[PDB]
Amino acid sequence: SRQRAMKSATDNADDLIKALTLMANRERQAQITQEISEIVGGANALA
């Protein structure tokens, strides 16, 4: 029972790692885009 439980637990942890990595990369891209938007907004406001 412990072998099977730990197999399923490591599979669930792997899938959680995958989902968290996907969301973290999503945010990373979002943060870069928003920072560029702010920088270019200021630069255009000055021109």
Binding site: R28, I32, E35, I36, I39, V40, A43, L46
Partner: protein, 517 residues
């Protein structure tokens, strides 16, 4: 006593021969000035990157050229710039003095000594933006540059002509790695052989002044200032100085490289140069990109780091080794400037704070660190005794989850676990104590030949230390022929094994136990 009338008659020499006839010059006028940038109307013939002379000996660099003005970066004493002043033309792009008189000095990013030991006798001048050696002007990187650090010299070897990035969060030991790489060339300098001597250039960009003073003190206490120059752009200097400092340090050491000499150059915190250039380009109102960087910042770093080369034999055979340092934030190697410099260089050394706190010092992550030159930058002895090391540590790192269940592991698995613990304790190393390549060969021989399986893991370091001590005193012949022949032939290995066994039966562990098989 002091040379008195020597002084007064030296200056009478200067003035009597004072000749400055009335030449025709092309002048402009400052129309605005702010935050270190000055716009100059006029100067129809000024060229890009040309040095301009403002009133009071102030210098600027003509960066932006358009139909109205010339946007120039003031190179210091900016608060003396006024609207209406007269700007004179020089006719020369940025150049620096170069020569052997620069060894042991601390200079501006202009060739001006800031240590106060007098002027620097200059051989020649050299432009900052001279092109890198052609693709056919080069030669395969084949000679090793010993850092004196077991982790680097065994796992991620550096050649002569290679670009090795040292990248880490902060307070991880990057400056220490480069200062030890510098100190390790002391014995090569003592040899007096121009094919083995390595001259060092340490570029300090944006650092506190006392930090540069401490680095120079460390290089002096190690006797490494006979072959080291420091190009210092302190944090108080202008943005133009921090942007120009590595180009000054690379213009020096290219004179040497083209004179058939071997040079090592350390760009401490290229990130601060990137930020100084971003400041300059934003004050000149150039289009910003990701993280507000100008868009030619990749060019800014790659143009600098491609001048580190290994020249062919018909160009003298000289070389320039680069050690650019990058400071990441929260181990984000996916940032902009980290990505650029990782793309540019020939290999990376990732230093981490988690490894630094666990006692792994130098905190080099040997799993992700890499050297794309590899075994071509090693001697035979080190290529032999350390080719076993990489997958040893891989196995240990994938086994250390079972550290609490070694009873349940196979024979070979527990063997790999113990060997990996020993090898991890082997690559640890104190600060400012670099080892020659023969002692590193002997230590990694201890590691990979199995002569550490009898020693407690909390006793490896001391053991190795004492053994090397013994070998330096009693059996110097092994180290000597390793140094001379670059290979550890089987008979030297026999004598070394017997020496190890004798030292073992003489060595006393800390728990009181034995270390004899």
């Amino acid at each position: 006593t002091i040379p008195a009338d020597d002084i007064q008659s030296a200056i009478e020499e200067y003035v009597s021969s004072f000749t400055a006839d009335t030449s025709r010059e092309e002048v402009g006028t400052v129309v605005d000035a702010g935050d270190g940038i000055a716009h100059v109307e006029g100067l129809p013939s000024v060229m890009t990157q040309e040095l301009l002379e403002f009133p009071g000996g102030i210098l600027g660099v003509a960066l932006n050229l358009d139909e109205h003005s010339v946007g120039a970066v003031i190179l210091g004493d900016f608060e003396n710039i006024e609207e209406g002043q007269q700007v004179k033309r020089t006719g020369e792009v940025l150049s620096v003095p170069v020569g052997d008189g620069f060894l042991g000095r601390v200079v501006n990013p202009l060739g001006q000594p800031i240590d106060g030991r007098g002027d620097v006798d200059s051989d020649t001048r050299r432009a900052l933006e001279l092109q890198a050696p052609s693709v056919v002007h080069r030669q395969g990187v084949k000679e090793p540059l010993q850092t004196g650090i077991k982790a680097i010299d065994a796992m991620t070897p550096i050649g002569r002509g290679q670009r090795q990035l040292i990248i880490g969060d902060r307070k991880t030991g990057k400056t220490a790695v480069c200062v030890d790489t510098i100190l390790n060339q002391r014995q090569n300098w003592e040899s007096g052989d121009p094919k083995k001597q390595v001259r060092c250039v340490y570029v300090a960009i944006g650092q506190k002044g006392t930090t540069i003073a401490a680095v120079r003190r460390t290089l002096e206490e190690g006797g490494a200032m006979d072959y080291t120059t420091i190009v210092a752009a302190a944090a108080s200097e202008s943005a133009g100085f921090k942007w120009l400092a590595p180009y000054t340090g690379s213009a020096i050491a290219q004179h040497w490289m083209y004179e058939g000499k071997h040079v090592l150059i350390i760009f401490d915190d290229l990130t601060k140069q990137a930020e100084a250039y971003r400041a300059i380009s934003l004050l000149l109102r150039r289009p910003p990109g990701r993280e507000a960087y100008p868009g030619d910042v990749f060019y800014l770093h790659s143009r600098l780091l491609e001048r580190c080369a290994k020249l062919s034999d018909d160009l003298g055979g000289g070389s320039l080794t680069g050690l650019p340092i990058i400071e990441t934030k929260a181990n984000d190697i996916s940032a902009y400037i980290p990505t650029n410099v990782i793309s540019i260089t020939d290999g990376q050394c990732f230093l981490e704070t988690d490894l630094f706190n666990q006692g792994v010092r130098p905190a080099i992550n040997v799993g992700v660190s890499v050297s794309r030159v590899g075994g071509a930058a090693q001697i035979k002895a080190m290529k032999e005794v350390a080719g076993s090391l990489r997958l040893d540590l891989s196995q240990y790192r994938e086994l250390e989850a079972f550290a609490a269940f070694a009873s349940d592991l196979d024979a070979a698995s527990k063997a790999q676990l113990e060997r990996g613990a020993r090898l991890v304790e082997l690559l640890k190393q104190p600060q400012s104590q670099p080892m020659p390549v023969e002692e590193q060969v002997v230590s990694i021989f201890l590691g990979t030949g199995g002569h550490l399986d009898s020693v407690p893991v909390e006793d490896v370091r001391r053991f190795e230390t004492e053994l090397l001590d013994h070998m330096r005193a009693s059996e110097e012949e092994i180290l000597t022929e390793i140094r001379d022949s670059q290979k550890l032939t089987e008979e030297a290995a026999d004598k070394l094994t017997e020496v190890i066994k004798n030292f073992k039966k003489g060595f006393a562990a800390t728990g009181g136990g034995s270390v004899v098989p």
